[PDB]
Design a protein around this ligand. Structure first.
Ligand SMILES: O=C1Cc2ccccc2N1
Length: 167
């Protein structure tokens, strides 16, 4: 049993809810929250900007030190950093950004990072300002992630379309 409430069950392991991931993280304090990161861990907008704002910029400060030591992530890659006030850990995952011309086949590699964690609160990778089709992102998620994933979808309209169209 876990703390996640109000989710619709899509599969054995994937759950979905219309929710602000920031407000959900604050309520649940999950072991892992996933950030929709870029390779530079520059948390300007989208999910990353919202998560970082909720940490009062402490996520960005920590991220800048990580990049200064390790250099950029790979598209499809990830790193584990602090969850600050939102979670125990933040898994920063880089999905391909279609608005930069990245290979959408890298979305499966991105989701494979989730399998290193038994339970996660996450957004749909490469959705929103990353430019991918969220319906496709949900399909790759279900077909790739084997661990227990709780997806937060900010937009109610999109949430209802994801559920109604789910095979
Ligand atoms: O609110 C939103 C923003 C967006 C981008 C692409 C597809 C669906 C949606 N819903």
């Amino acid at each position: 049993v876990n703390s996640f409430s109000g989710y619709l069950k899509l599969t054995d392991n994937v759950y979905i809810k219309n929710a602000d991931i920031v407000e959900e993280a604050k309520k649940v304090k999950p072991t892992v929250v996933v950030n929709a990161a870029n390779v530079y861990l520059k948390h300007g907008g989208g999910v990353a900007g919202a998560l970082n704002k909720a940490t009062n910029n402490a996520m960005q400060v920590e991220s800048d030190d990580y990049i200064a030591t390790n250099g950029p992530l790979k598209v499809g890659g990830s790193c584990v950093l602090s969850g600050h006030n939102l979670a125990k850990h933040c898994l920063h995952v880089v999905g391909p950004n279609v608005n930069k011309g990245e290979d959408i086949q890298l979305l499966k590699s991105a989701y494979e990072n989730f399998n290193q964690h038994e339970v996660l609160l996450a957004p749909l990778l490469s959705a929103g300002i990353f430019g991918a089709d969220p319906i496709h992102s949900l399909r790759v998620c279900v077909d790739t992630v084997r661990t227990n994933v709780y997806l937060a979808v900010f937009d109610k309209n999109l949430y209802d379309k994801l559920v109604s169209s789910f095979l």
